[PDB]
From a paper:
Here, we present the first crystal structure of the extracellular domain of YknZ from Bacillus amyloliquefaciens. From the diffraction dataset, the crystals were found to belong to the orthorhombic space group P212121, with unit-cell parameters of a = 44.2, b = 46.2, and c = 87.5 Å. The upper subdomain was formed by residues 103–219 and was composed of a seven-stranded antiparallel β-sheet with four α-helices. The DaliLite server revealed that the structure of Aa MacB PCD was highly similar to Ba YknZ ED, which was found to be the top match and showed a Z-score of 20.1 and sequence identity of up to 22%. The most significant structural difference is the number of β-strands; the lower subdomain of Ba YknZ ED contained three β-strands, while the other structures each contain four β-strands. The purified YknX protein was not bound to the CNbr-activated region, which is in sharp contrast to the strong binding of YknX to YknZ ED.
The four-component transporter YknWXYZ in Bacillus has been implicated in the protection against SDP-dependent killing by expelling invading SDP toxin from the cytosol. The activity of YknYZ strictly depends on two accessory proteins, YknX and YknW. Unlike most dimeric ABC-type transporters, MacB and YknYZ are characterized as non-canonical ABC-type transporters, which consist of a four-transmembrane segment, an N-terminal nucleotide binding domain (NBD), and a large periplasmic domain.
Author numbering: 16 to 33, 39 to 148, 156 to 214
Write the structure that this text describes.
């Protein structure tokens, strides 16, 4: 019962204005009829570093709805709290693979990993294939200057709402951005 929103401007759209979702967008969507939850992330590739070890990782800056909806399961340590998202703490939850690459069999919990030159305390390792770390989206703003989400889905209350909620959510997006039909769900 989730549907993803995409940004694809038409030629009619591009020649009026020479994938971006704002915080305003994420907050608006939550109030769209039929929306149970908003699933939002900013996905970026970069190197992560601990001591003498380097690996390439996926860093996901997410909102509070993302964990909610995604069956993301922490095996050791803890998951994010709503205040972690609020304050944008320098806190990260890492996959088993990236923990193994950077730490081997040593516990990563409490250690500082440097992602793209930014320090992040590992507060959780996920249940078990990819090297990826999750951090509060608000941490991306201050640390990397990332102020938009790259990927957004909405979860509906029921399956029969997808078509209409999806459409409404897409219109809302277009209206916030002043675009005609750039934002859309699959028809």
């Amino acid at each position: 019962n989730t549907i993803e929103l995409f940004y694809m401007p038409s030629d009619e759209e591009l020649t009026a204005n020479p994938a971006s979702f704002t915080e305003e967008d994420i907050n608006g969507l939550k109030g769209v009829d039929g929306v149970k939850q908003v699933v939002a992330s900013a996905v970026k590739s970069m190197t992560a570093r601990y001591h003498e070890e380097d690996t390439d990782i996926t860093l996901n800056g997410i909102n509070s709805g993302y964990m909610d909806v995604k069956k993301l399961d922490v095996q050791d340590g803890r998951t994010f709290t709503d205040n972690d998202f609020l304050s944008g703490k320098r806190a990260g939850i890492i996959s088993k693979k990236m923990a193994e690459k950077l730490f081997g069999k040593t516990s990563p919990l409490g250690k500082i990993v440097w992602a793209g030159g930014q320090p992040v305390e590992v507060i959780g390792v996920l249940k078990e294939g990819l090297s990826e770390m999750y951090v509060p989206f608000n941490m991306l703003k201050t640390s990397f200057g990332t102020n938009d989400y790259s990927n957004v889905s909405v979860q509906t209350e029921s399956a029969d709402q997808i078509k209409s909620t999806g459409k409404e959510a897409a219109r809302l997006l277009n209206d916030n951005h002043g675009t005609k039909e750039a934002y859309q769900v699959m028809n």
